RNA sequence: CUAGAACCCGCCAAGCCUCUCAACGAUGCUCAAAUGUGCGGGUCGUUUU
RNA sequence: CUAGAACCCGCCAAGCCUCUCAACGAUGCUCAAAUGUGCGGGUCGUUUU
C-alpha cells in the first residue's frame, strides 16, 4: 500500500489551490474564516457535487461558487433539525405504549425484570448488563429516593423507561414472548408486527443520523424498509425509491398521524424546500407530484 | 426496606384520580390520549410545580389546569431544540480548530496517532481503544477507500476528526503535552487554558442534556463553571446564579460571538420566552435586566 | 447497527374459517385469529445536483 | 461525566519583567511569557413557578 503524499495545507494556500481548481471565490476573508472554523475536508463532502464528471482530476465544473457549498451545508444542517424535532415525539410514544400495554396485559408493575416473559435469556441477560450499567451510574431525582425507600430490585416500568436509551427499548420490544402483547402494541400504531419492527429500526437509525451531524440529503441508505400488506391508515401510491431520505420522512409521518392527528410536518417540509429552493429534489428521492398522496393531505 | 404498594393504574382511572386531587380537566378524551401516549410518570415531573407546598400529601395547589402541564412540557421541548441548534456550530468549530492548529504547530498530518505528543500514556492507550473501536466498525464513504489505498495505520487528523464523538475530542485536547499548542487553541477562542477546558466540559454536558430529552428549565446543575480572569470579549456584569440554565446559554453565546459575529441567538431566546410568556424567568436563573449586558447586545 | 436488529422467495412443524373455492376443510390464510424467534436459497458496494 | 473530566483557598519545584513596588529582582506574576498534568485543605444533596 502507498505512502500518503499530501502535507498539511494552510487555509491561505487552500484558497489559492481552490482558485486554481476553478472555483469562484468572493469576500475572501470570510472563506478563509470558514476554512479555519468549519474546515476543508468537512466541506469537501459538499464541494463534491460541483466537481466535473471525471472527478478523479479534482477539477470543478465551470461557473461554480463557494456560496453554493455554503448553501448545501446550511440546507443539510436545517434538514437534520427538522427530522429530529419530529423523531422526539415517536421516541416518547413508543416507550409509553410498551410500558402501558405490558402493565395492562401482564398485571404486574415489574414485568420488565423477569426472564420468563422474554424469548431468549441469551439476549435478556445481555440487556440486564445495560440496565445495571445505567442504574450503577444514575443519580437522578427519583432513582435514589426509590432505592432508599423501597425493597424490590428494579423500579417498575414507568420509572425505568425514563432512564433507558431508545436502542435498549426497541431491543426489549423484539424479545417479548407472548405474541398477543406484541400484536396489541403494534395494533395501537396501526400496523402488523414485522413492519412495525422494521420501522422501529429505521426510526432508530434515522435518529442516529441526526444526532451525529452526518450528511443526509443525498446519502444512499442500505437498510431497506419493509412494505406492509395490512394497514390502518393512509399510505403512498406512486412508486418511490426506498433508499433515499424520502421514505424515512414517510415512516415518521405515518407514526405522527396516529400520535398527533392535527400535526403540521408537511408545512415544515414545504417551508424548508421552498426556502432553500436551489436544490434538486430528485437527489432527495421524492418522486414528482408527491403532494397528491393520501398520507400528505 | 418497604415493599412497593402501588399497582398499575389504568389510564381511565388516573383521570378520576387527578380530578380527586383537584386538577381541573377539560376535553377529557385528549387528556386520556396524552396519558396513553406521553404517559403519567413522564408528565409527573411537570405536574410537580403545581402541587401545593406540603407536597407529601400529593394534592394540587388550587385553580390549576392540565393545560399548564402541557404548557411547561412544550416549552421545555422547544428549549432543548433551541440549545442544540447552537451547540452544533461549536461542536464543529472546536474539532476543526484542534486539527488545524495541531497540524500547523507540529508539522505532521498524523500527530493524533503518536503517544510522544501526549502527557499520559495511561489515558492515550485508553483512548486508542475507542479510536480502534470506531475504525473497527466504520464503513463510510472515505474511510474504506483510504485504507484500501494507503499504507499508514490511521488517517490524518482532518479525516479522523469526522468520525470521532465530541467526548473523545475534548478528552484528546486535555492530554496535549506542549502547552504552547494549548495556549494557541485557547487563544483562538479568546480565553486562557483552564476556563476553556471548563467551558468545553460544560458544553459537552449541555449537549448531553439536549440529546436525551431531560428536564432542563428548572433543573439544578451541579458541575459549576469556572470564572475567567483574562478575557478577549464581552461578558456578564450583574451577579448571577451559576447552577441554573442561564450560565450555559452565556457560555454558548461567548463561543458563538467568536465563531459567528453576526449571530442571532438573542433573537431566538427572546422570541422563545415571549411566545411562552406564562413561565417565571427567576426559576430559569436569569437575573432581572439581562438585556443590559455587553454580551447580549 | 444505515452490508443490516436489512429486504425478497420457496420449503417445514401446528392451527383456523377473516378472505377464496365443485370440495367444507384445502384448490385458502400465517401481515385475520393463532403462533415458532424453524430451515435453505438470492440480490443489494454507500453523492447523476 | 450535570457529587464532577466540578468549583474555591493556601503551600512547592522552576522561571520572567506584562503588571506593581524604596528595592531592580521580590514587597510582584503563574489565567503576561514560560510551564508541572505537583501536594494538602474546604464547601456543594440535584423542581420557591
In the 3-class helix/strand/coil scheme, how is A65-129 assigned residue by residue? EHHHHHHHHHHHHHHHHHHHHHHHHHHHHHHHHHHHHHHHHHCCCCHHHCHHHECCHHHHHHHHH
The three-state secondary structure class of A227 is coil
Exposure string of B236-263, with b = 16+ CB inside 10 Å and e = fewer, is beeeeeeebbbbbbbbbbbbbbbbeeee
Give the separation between CA A224 and CA A82, rounded to whole angstroms.
Answer: 22
Give the separation between CA B25 and CA A169, rounded to whole angstroms.
Answer: 31
Give the separation between CA A185 and CA B262, rounded to whole angstroms.
Answer: 49
Nucleotide nearest residue A173, measured CA to C1':
C5
Give the separation between CA B111 and CA B119, rounded to whole angstroms.
Answer: 14
Give the separation between CA A15 and CA A25, rounded to whole angstroms.
Answer: 8
Give the separation between CA B159 and CA B152, rounded to whole angstroms.
Answer: 13
Q: Which residues 73-92 of A interface with strand C at a CB distance below 7 A?
A: none
Residues 6+ apart with CB under 8 A from A62: A22, A52
Give bridge partners of residue A60 from the DSSP assignment.
Answer: A51
> What nucleotides of chain C have any atom within 7 angstroms of a protein Cβ?
1-8, 30-37, 44-49
Cβ contacts (< 8 Å) between A45 and chain B: which residues?
Answer: 141
DSSP string, B49-81: GGB-SSGGG-PBPTT-BHHHHHHHHHHHHHHHH
Q: Assess contact for B232 and B191: CB atoms under 8 A.
A: yes
Among B296, B151, B143, B162, CA closest to B233: B296
Among A37, A176, A33, CA closest to A99: A176
Q: What's the residue count for chain B?
A: 297
Q: Are the Cβ atoms of A150 and B2 closer than 8 angstroms?
A: yes
- Is the torsion defined by CA of A273, A277, A278, A280 positive or negative? positive
Q: Are the Cβ atoms of A41 and B6 closer than 8 angstroms?
A: no
| Deposited experimental method | cryo-EM
| Chain A interface, best mutation among B14, B39, B156, B216, by max A CB count within 10 A | B39
The three-state secondary structure class of B285 is coil
Among B108, B112, B121, CA closest to B173: B112
Nucleotide nearest residue A118, measured CA to C1':
C37
- Report the 10 Å Cβ neighbour count for B160: 20
Distance B180 CA to D34 C1' (A): 9
Q: What stretches of chain B show up as alpha helix (H) in DSSP?
A: 13-20, 28-37, 40-47, 66-106, 121-135, 143-149, 157-160, 166-173, 179-188, 193-211, 246-259, 265-275
Give the separation between CA A294 and CA A140, rounded to whole angstroms.
Answer: 44
Ramachandran region, residue B61 (left: φ > 0; alpha: ψ -120 to 50; beta: rest): beta
Place of cell 424498509: A225
Q: Assess contact for B281 and B238: CB atoms under 8 A.
A: no
Cβ contacts (< 8 Å) between B156 and chain A: which residues?
Answer: 4, 6, 8
Minimal Cβ distance to A158: which of B4, B40, B84: B40
Q: Assess contact for B291 and B281: CB atoms under 8 A.
A: no
How many beta-carbon pairs under 8 angstroms link A with B? 122
Question: How far A81 CA sits from the closest chain B CA (Å)?
Answer: 7
Q: What's the residue count for chain A?
A: 297
Amino acid at each position: 500500500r502507498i505512502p500518503f503524499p499530501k502535507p498539511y495545507t494552510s487555509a491561505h494556500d487552500l484558497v489559492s489551490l481552490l482558485q486554481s481548481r476553478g472555483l469562484t471565490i468572493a469576500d475572501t476573508a470570510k472563506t478563509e474564516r470558514y476554512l479555519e472554523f468549519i474546515g476543508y475536508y468537512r466541506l469537501s463532502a459538499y464541494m463534491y457535487p460541483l466537481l466535473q464528471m471525471p472527478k478523479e482530476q479534482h477539477r470543478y465544473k465551470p461557473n461554480t461558487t463557494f456560496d453554493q457549498v455554503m448553501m448545501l451545508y446550511r440546507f443539510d444542517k436545517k434538514l437534520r433539525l427538522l427530522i429530529f424535532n419530529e423523531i422526539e415525539k415517536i421516541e416518547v410514544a413508543v416507550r409509553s405504549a410498551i410500558v402501558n400495554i405490558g402493565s395492562d396485559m401482564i398485571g404486574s408493575p415489574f414485568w420488565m425484570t423477569d426472564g420468563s416473559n422474554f424469548i431468549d435469556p441469551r439476549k435478556f441477560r445481555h440487556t440486564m448488563d445495560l440496565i445495571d450499567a445505567e442504574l450503577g451510574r444514575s443519580r437522578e431525582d427519583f432513582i435514589v429516593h426509590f432505592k432508599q425507600t423501597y425493597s424490590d430490585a428494579y423500579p417498575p416500568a414507568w420509572i425505568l423507561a425514563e432512564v433507558l436509551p431508545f436502542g435498549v427499548i426497541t431491543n426489549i420490544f423484539s424479545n417479548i414472548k407472548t405474541a398477543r402483547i406484541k400484536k396489541s402494541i403494534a395494533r395501537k400504531f396501526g400496523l402488523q408486527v414485522a413492519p412495525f419492527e422494521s420501522w422501529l429500526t429505521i426510526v432508530a437509525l434515522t435518529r442516529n443520523s441526526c444526532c451525529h451531524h452526518a450528511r443526509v440529503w443525498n446519502k444512499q441508505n442500505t437498510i431497506r424498509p419493509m412494505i406492509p400488506n395490512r394497514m390502518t391508515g393512509r399510505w403512498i401510491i406512486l412508486p418511490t425509491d426506498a433508499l433515499r431520505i424520502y421514505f424515512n420522512l414517510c415512516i415518521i409521518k405515518y407514526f405522527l398521524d396516529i400520535i398527533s392527528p392535527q400535526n403540521d410536518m408537511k408545512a415544515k417540509i414545504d417551508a424548508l424546500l421552498s426556502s432553500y429552493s436551489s436544490i434538486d429534489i430528485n437527489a432527495m428521492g421524492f418522486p414528482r407530484g408527491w403532494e397528491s398522496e393520501p398520507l400528505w393531505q
